[PDB]
Amino acid sequence: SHHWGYGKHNGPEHWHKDFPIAKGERQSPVDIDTHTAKYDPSLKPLSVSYDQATSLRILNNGHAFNVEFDDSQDKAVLKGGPLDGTYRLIQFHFHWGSLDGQGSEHTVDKKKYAAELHLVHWNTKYGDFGKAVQQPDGLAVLGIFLKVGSAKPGLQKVVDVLDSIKTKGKSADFTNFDPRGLLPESLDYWTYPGSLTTPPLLECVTWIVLKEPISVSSEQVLKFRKLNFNGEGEPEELMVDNWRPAQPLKNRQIKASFK
Ligand SMILES: [Cu+2]
Ligand SMILES: [Zn+2]
Numbered sequence: 001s002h003h004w005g006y007g008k009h010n011g012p013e014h015w016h017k018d019f020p021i022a023k024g025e026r027q028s029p030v031d032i033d034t035h036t037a038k039y040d041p042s043l044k045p046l047s048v049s050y051d052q053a054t055s056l057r058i059l060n061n062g063h064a065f066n067v068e069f070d071d072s073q074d075k076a077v078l079k080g081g082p083l084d085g086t087y088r089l090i091q092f093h094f095h096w097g098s099l100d101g102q103g104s105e106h107t108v109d110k111k112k113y114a115a116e117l118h119l120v121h122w123n124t125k126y127g128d129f130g131k132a133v134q135q136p137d138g139l140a141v142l143g144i145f146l147k148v149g150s151a152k153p154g155l156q157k158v159v160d161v162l163d164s165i166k167t168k169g170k171s172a173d174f175t176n177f178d179p180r181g182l183l184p185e186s187l188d189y190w191t192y193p194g195s196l197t198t199p200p201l202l203e204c205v206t207w208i209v210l211k212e213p214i215s216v217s218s219e220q221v222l223k224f225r226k227l228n229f230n231g232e233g234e235p236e237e238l239m240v241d242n243w244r245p246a247q248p249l250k251n252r253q254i255k256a257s258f259k
Helices: 153-165 218-224
Strands: 046-049 055-060 065-069 077-080 087-096 115-123 139-148 171-173 189-194 205-210 214-216
Touching: 055 153, 065 153, 077 115, 087 139, 087 218, 139 218, 153 171, 153 218
Parallel strands: 139 205, 139 214
Antiparallel strands: 046 077, 055 065, 055 171, 065 087, 077 087, 087 115, 115 139, 189 205
16 A cells, blocks of 8 residues: 555554554564564574575665565575475565664574564575465565674675665666675574564565674765655755564574574
8 A cells, every 4th residue: 555654654553453463463574572482493504595586776765775686587586494386586674773773683592682684585496576475485585684884895895886776766777786785694593473673574485594693884884874755846854763673472482493
């Protein structure tokens, strides 16, 4: 639907009126209580295969910016871990704060990171993204926390194009970007069944949240905060605090791939 956002009058506390699944049984994000998470020795190794990833474009959609990929062939896929089958990369985006002390969607023992990266993948058994989001195992989102510290060299090409997509609806060419430069050293993770974190809030997602954050510089996150939620020629509303807070865990268990 239109006109949802992150403001006081249309933010997360209002979403349930148009998207009643907002109060559902497997909503995201959640707080990850690390002491309560259980190590699962049955999980298999996570396989991230991005060598042939083919980026196309970057778009300001009014709530974040998306780096889009060619998903017409198995070029960039996620497999293993909790997943059955093959999941194809379609886009990545971030959520971030107005201040370095907030911005992530997931939290770790109630800790909020400065930002969170979401690599969005769809289950190839379902043929395309739109059919995948009608299935309870349709999507897999790999989540990576950002902390402020040293610069992330592999983020810099993304930061450098943001000036060209300041406002809602703007896009730019974004070919030949390698998303492998956004991953931490370790692929140790937590996993649980959840949902999209923005409307339509669909309950289709296997969440895979990496334990190790990546470090980005202050200057890099400051450039995220210069984007606009609004369209060109409309009153400026900085794109900041585009995160949903933690939702009730309900009848779920978070599993860890490590001890
Ligand atoms: Cu609408
Ligand atoms: Zn997201």
